[PDB]
Design a protein around this ligand. Sequence first.
Ligand SMILES: Nc1nc2c(ncn2[C@@H]2O[C@H](COP(=O)(O)OP(=O)(O)O)[C@@H](OP(=O)(O)OP(=O)(O)O)[C@H]2O)c(=O)[nH]1
Ligand SMILES: [Mg+2]
Length: 294
Amino acid sequence: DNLTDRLSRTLRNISGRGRLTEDNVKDTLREVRMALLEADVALPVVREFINRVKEKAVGHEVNKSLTPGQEFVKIVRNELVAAMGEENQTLNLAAQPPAVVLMAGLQGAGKTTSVGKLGKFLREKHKKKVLVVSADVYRPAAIKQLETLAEQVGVDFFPSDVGQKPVDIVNAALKEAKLKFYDVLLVDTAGRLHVDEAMMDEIKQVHASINPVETLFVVDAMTGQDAANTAKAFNEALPLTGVVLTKVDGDARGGAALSIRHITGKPIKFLGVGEKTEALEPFHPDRIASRILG
Ligand SMILES: Nc1nc2c(ncn2[C@@H]2O[C@H](COP(=O)(O)OP(=O)(O)O)[C@@H](OP(=O)(O)OP(=O)(O)O)[C@H]2O)c(=O)[nH]1
Ligand SMILES: [Mg+2]
């Protein structure tokens, strides 16, 4: 990423210094603010991050250590993690089976792909008997896409077709999920390229009839700051439990990851890091912060 190089260079010079002047701390923070802003991180997030470092990096606290540069570096890390999220947020599949995970996103965010990815993760790493279904009757080849995905990853597919109504489709799928003791039902959805009441009304009807335990917004990382604004929109119309940030491999900037948790107020739970089925990665903020700073 270009954020990783910029921050790592700015921090590296400070680490060696055995004492940091207040001007030295202020100058380094201005360079950090520019790097995050250049990475499409939202100003509300950058502003709060810089203020939190400044308060904790007062020279008295930083200069007390024998490695003041090191102490400053590791404040920046701690506050980056705080912005990206709280520890690891997982899906609650511990409630009454079947566990319904309803997935939303605008078209091309990668929700259908992510449906597959998640089903492989739940069966392989959690030994969950999984069933998936598609309420995207607007594109026919889409339903097939899920079907093909479901066999590559080894979950079960509940069939649907163009003529039928999304509410009827998920009601059938839950009924069936109960009858064969499935652990989770993942429910794919249609996307409209914009968060419009047309899209929200359909999701909220599905959502209402099927009481999902997790509502996951799939958002595309290479839309940068829009990802947070798009998810803040869906969240305002129908509350989210988690976000899946897809196409992280190609962004090369970041910012959606730093921005989503604080703009939306809900966590990034998963992270799409490849076109392949294996490329789903639970979101651990500590690991991401470490990579950004080296
Ligand atoms: N690099 C990368 N790509 C991802 C990731 N997740 C999804 N994609 C890509 O997103 C594209 C759209 O996926 P869909 O699953 O159809 O998205 P949708 O359900 O929201 O409509 C796919 O591209 P496609 O159909 O192969 O081509 P195109 O649609 O991009 O033209 C897929 O390969 C990811 O984590 N990393
Ligand atoms: Mg689709």
